[PDB]
Amino acid sequence: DRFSVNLDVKHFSPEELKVKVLGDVIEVHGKHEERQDEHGFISREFHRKYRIPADVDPLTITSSMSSDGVLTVNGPRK
Amino acid sequence: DRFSVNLDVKHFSPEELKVKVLGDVIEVHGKHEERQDEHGFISREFHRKYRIPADVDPLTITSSMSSDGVLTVNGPRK
């Protein structure tokens, strides 16, 4: 029992991600500079927005990141 | 129902922390270079070791970090 959304961000280090709560919107921004991988070189950037449900206080929204590279944003329901 | 230890690492960015599982030991290493804060300048380093309980498979150990600056290391019991 709680609001929760998950996002696969394994291509981004925690420092390349920012989570912000603006009004009743959760904003997740990810950006990394050109980086070498198995296939060549790559840079990535995304901006994701979630609507916070009415029964969830935006002030109580927190987040966590797993060693899996999964970002979780969650909050208690009121 | 699950093995879990928490560690307050709010003074360290995720990239300044490393979690390693060696045998049945969880190793958490934190280190940050000299950094300005409210009181002056500070560098910190710690090395913490936890014993993994017998009924916990070390291979299934994962971790996560909260926006609170709390590091959690956890694993299912077998």
Author numbering:
A (entry chain A), B (entry chain A): 73 to 150
Question: Can I see the authors' text?
Answer:
Small Hsps (sHsps) form large oligomeric assemblies with a high capacity for holding onto nonnative proteins that are handed over to the ATP-driven chaperone machines for refolding. sHsps are ubiquitous among the kingdoms of life and within mammalian genomes occur in large families with members differentially expressed in many tissues including muscle, brain and the eye lens. Small Hsp sequences have in common an “α-crystallin domain” (ACD) of around 90 amino acids, with most having a short conserved C-terminal extension bearing an I-X-I motif and a longer variable N-terminal extension. The ACD is an immunoglobulin-like beta sandwich comprising strands β2–β9, and the assembly unit is a dimer. The conserved arginine in human sHsps is on the β6 + 7 strand at the dimer interface, not far from the dyad axis.
Here we have solved the X-ray structure of the ACD dimer of human αB R120G close to physiological pH, as well as higher-resolution αB ACD wild-type controls. Two mutations improved the diffraction resolution of crystals of human αB ACD: L137M substitution and truncation of the β2-strand. The highest-resolution structure was solved from a β2-strand truncated construct, αB ACD L137SeM (residues 71–157). The RMSD between the high-resolution 71–157 αB ACD (2 Å resolution) and the R120G ACD (2.5 Å resolution) is equal to 1.589 Å2. The sHsp wild-type ACD X-ray structures all have a deep groove that runs down the AP dimer interface. The groove is maintained through sequence changes, register shifts and across a wide pH range. The base of the groove is lined with four arginines, Arg120 and Arg116 on each of the β6 + 7 strands.
